[PDB]
């Protein structure tokens, strides 16, 4: 078939959504990466890495 | 933003030296708990009450009108008796009274 | 979401008698993207001084 | 060792309490066609007995002693075979029960109305017609616990009718949405609902919800939303000081007035008594006609319509 | 399945329940006296840990025993409701309503006591009746303070409700501020200047 | 009427509980969802 | 000139709105609104006597 899916917003010309007739932007986030991190922390009980 | 507690408030004036006169009755629970409702002089006094427990009470006038409580509005046994017949069930409580016989002694 | 309901109706609707139109709920996803684009501290107000 | 295991799982906290339910409801296992036949004939079989004991007690019987202790047994056994019967299907209460969540209510809350259903069940089972009991049950679990959603799921308590107006209008809306894809016109879900247009907006003002007080300043839960809600219903503290003075300066222009006549109008507008009373109640107390009080009511209003008392009064409409 | 063995063998001797009317039984059996001398002899005599284990009951001891109060109350039979008008329905601009989010929490406490009265009134098993009970238990738990004991009662959108305790408590409840600090009438403010004249 | 000069918390009990109350709510509705009165 | 104007924050009240569950006045200058009198305004009163 050809499902209507639903209406999306699309950014304008500028950068900007127009949500409601009001002007919204979407602020880029900086998050932690997924992965691996090795890390360390020392003892004073024992002085050891 | 603006809100109501769906109430009005009237911007009158006590009027303390002059109230309608006021009667007092008494009113009593089963369990011998004793209420005073400052009722208006004017009007009728209905014996049962309900009052600041909760529960119903009486005037300790006695009245006692005896509003005929209603039956309780239907049963187990009303709902299996529809759907059944007595003569069914006698048959069925002949079958387990012969069973728990033929368990017992043998 | 969209999925959960529609592997929830897989299997209840009857076979040989269904189509994507039947089957996929809309309802779900964009009510997911109105709920980004509004009310979310992403999806700031455009600050135009 | 593994057995070991499971007994000590067996005993922990479970401190969810519907982890803990079902952990509980876990003891009991399922049951088949004749022993659900076993149970209906020991249940109406006790039920019986129990009515004819209390037939027999009433005027009757110094019952036989081996009869009496049997019959007593039968009695207790009725109950017993019934109990079982509901710890049976405990758990196709809860499988019902499960996919009405998600909404308006909590899920054991809907556990306890599916049980009330079943005891309602069990109370009206016939093994006669042969057939399975959950065929039977499921009717009453769903009607039960439908009726409890119905009208235990809102703050401002709709009656059940209009809960199944608004179920079947949001019902025929999302399949309009759904299907039409365009988004659905009110007068369209009338004609489509065979009503009104005018029911169909007072059913979309019915089923709005209350939100909280304690919810987003604006957006955010920074600070209670009651913390900005105004109270049109409160003391403004320029009415009652303006009240007062006007209490005053209208006593004062009354009192300005003639004697006897200012003193009707005040009975008439009850300045004193709080009630107005009628021709016939100021006569009475006077001991006149009416005729003359409406003469003296309006050679009276004539004169506070002049300006000097009208000007220290006009200001305060 | 030990205590069912047990008790309809053994039904006499004794007497055993489970929920909170037990607690109740077990404090209306309790003298505060001889337990509160046994604690003093053993503060006096025992030494260690359980010189501190006796140290720190008998702080709750000697509390009940020093004044009047009966430690009954601390099992609950009636539940007070606060008055409306601390916890509003409110009609917005908009034909909108606001709740308190107490109405709620009440609502629940009340749904299911109603139900446990059916439900005893009618006949009920032991299973059904004790789901109840705990449930009860639970409600009233939420009504006091949320947060405690499983998890948040949560609303619409996944937000934890208000109970009385969260009213209390907190740098935004009556106790610390709206008492101490409030919004007051004839005031005002504005950005300032230097007044060199002045 | 000030006058105030102590403060006495204490562990209230049922009776002290169901004298206080003016009613026993016995209801779980709020208002008439028609005519808007409690 | 930066939009931190005077119009935007000069503000009083003799007497306004009132908040809604407790009865203090309201506040934010979108009413009428009041001044916080907070608790460290309550010590400073304090300590002058």
Known sequence: ?49 | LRGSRLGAVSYETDRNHDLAPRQIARYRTDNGEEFEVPFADDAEIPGTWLCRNGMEGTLIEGDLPEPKKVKPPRTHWDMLLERRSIEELEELLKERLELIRSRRRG | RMERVVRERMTTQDVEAITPQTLINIRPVVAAIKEFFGTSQLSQFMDQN | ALRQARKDAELTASADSVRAYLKQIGKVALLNAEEEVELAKRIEAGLYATQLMTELSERGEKLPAAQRRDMMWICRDGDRAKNHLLEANLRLVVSLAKRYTGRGMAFLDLIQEGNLGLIRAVEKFDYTKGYKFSTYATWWIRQAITRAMADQARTIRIPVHMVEVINKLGRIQRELLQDLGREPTPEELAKEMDITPEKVLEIQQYAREPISLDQTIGDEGDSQLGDFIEDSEAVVAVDAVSFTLLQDQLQSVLDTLSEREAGVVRLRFGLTDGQPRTLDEIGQVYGVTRERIRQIESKTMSKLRHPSRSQVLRDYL | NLYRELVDRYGEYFTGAMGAESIQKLIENFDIDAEAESLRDVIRNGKGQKKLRALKRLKVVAAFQQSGNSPMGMVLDAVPVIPPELRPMVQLDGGRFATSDLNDLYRRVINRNNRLKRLIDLGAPEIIVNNEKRMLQESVDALFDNGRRGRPVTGPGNRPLKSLSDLLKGKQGRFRQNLLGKRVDYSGRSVIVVGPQL | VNFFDELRIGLATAEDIRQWSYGEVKKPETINYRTLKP | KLHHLVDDKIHARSTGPYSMITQQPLGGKAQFGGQRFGEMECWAMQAYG
């Not at chain 1, 050809?2 to 500028?14: A, I, L, Q, R, S």
């Open chain 1, 1 to 49: 078939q050809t499902v209507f899916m639903g209406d999306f917003p699309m950014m304008t010309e500028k950068g900007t959504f127009i949500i409601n007739g009001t002007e919204r932007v979407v602020v880029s986030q900086l998050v932690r990466s997924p992965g691996v991190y090795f890390d360390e922390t020392i003892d004073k009980s024992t002085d050891k890495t």
